[PDB]
Amino acid sequence: GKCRGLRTARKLRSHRRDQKWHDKQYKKAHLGTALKANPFGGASHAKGIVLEKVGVEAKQPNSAIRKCVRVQLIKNGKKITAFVPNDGCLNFIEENDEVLVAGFGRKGHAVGDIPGVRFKVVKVANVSLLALYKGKKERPR
């Protein structure tokens, strides 16, 4: 059992502090390896340059080709795969253009069928993918 003594404050606090390191979220948020291995470097978004268009095959139960792009981040030169969300939206992207990329919503985790893809394209050429999708804006010339 646990120690219940008026002078056990140090032991209880030390035990709590050591046992917190066995929590995956606490260890992730307090070690620095996750922060240093995060391609965004702790940011919410990052700008990158599209290196090529790729088609990632959905996981085994489903069957589709998710259109993604290989982008190299300007901040650190790291290469990542960013999903191009909507349909026909890969047509809005051209090679070697600047894209603003956010996370996929699961904090470094793959989302849905797309295996190993944790980023999604938010902007291409300083215009949001949603504005191009609905015809609100057109690609800069």
Binding site: G5, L6, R7, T8, A9, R10, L12, R13
Partner: protein, 151 residues
């Protein structure tokens, strides 16, 4: 014993000892008055300080220190320095989240006058805060209370 154990002559600065002598007033020794003061806060001057021969400029009773500020207590744990002893102050620190306490301690290096003979490890000492006496000494032993196990 012989108080002149240093390369400089040891004396109380207040006392003028080589006043002009008198042959009839000589009785074997020249006689030496003792400078002593009472520190405040109801602390009695030990009989040693009033009737001793030691020279200690950091003694609260015969030296040049003033007792002002905190009056603290502790148990003597080391007596390996010259006129300085290491006492241990023990206490309980309250951790609020656990509503509990932890045993903490810290060691204070305090000046011990030669007027306090028979001070032992485990004795309780009431010390008074003075000006910095050395790098780490800021308290002077004012009173010594024996440990119950002494015999």
């Amino acid at each position: 014993a012989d108080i002149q154990t240093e390369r400089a002559y040891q004396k109380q600065p207040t006392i003028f000892q080589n006043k002009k002598r008198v042959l009839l007033g000589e009785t074997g020794k020249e006689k030496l008055p003792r400078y002593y003061k009472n520190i405040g806060l109801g602390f009695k001057t030990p009989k040693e300080a009033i009737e001793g021969t030691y020279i200690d400029k950091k003694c609260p009773f015969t030296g040049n220190v003033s007792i002002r500020g905190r009056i603290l207590s502790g148990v003597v744990t080391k007596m390996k320095m010259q006129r300085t002893i290491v006492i241990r102050r023990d206490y309980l620190h309250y951790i609020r989240k656990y509503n509990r306490f932890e045993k903490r301690h810290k060691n204070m290096s305090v000046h011990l006058s030669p007027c306090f003979r028979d001070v032992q490890i485990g004795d309780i000492v009431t010390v008074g805060e003075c000006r910095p006496l050395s790098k780490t000494v800021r308290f002077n032993v004012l009173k010594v209370t024996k440990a119950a196990g002494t015999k």
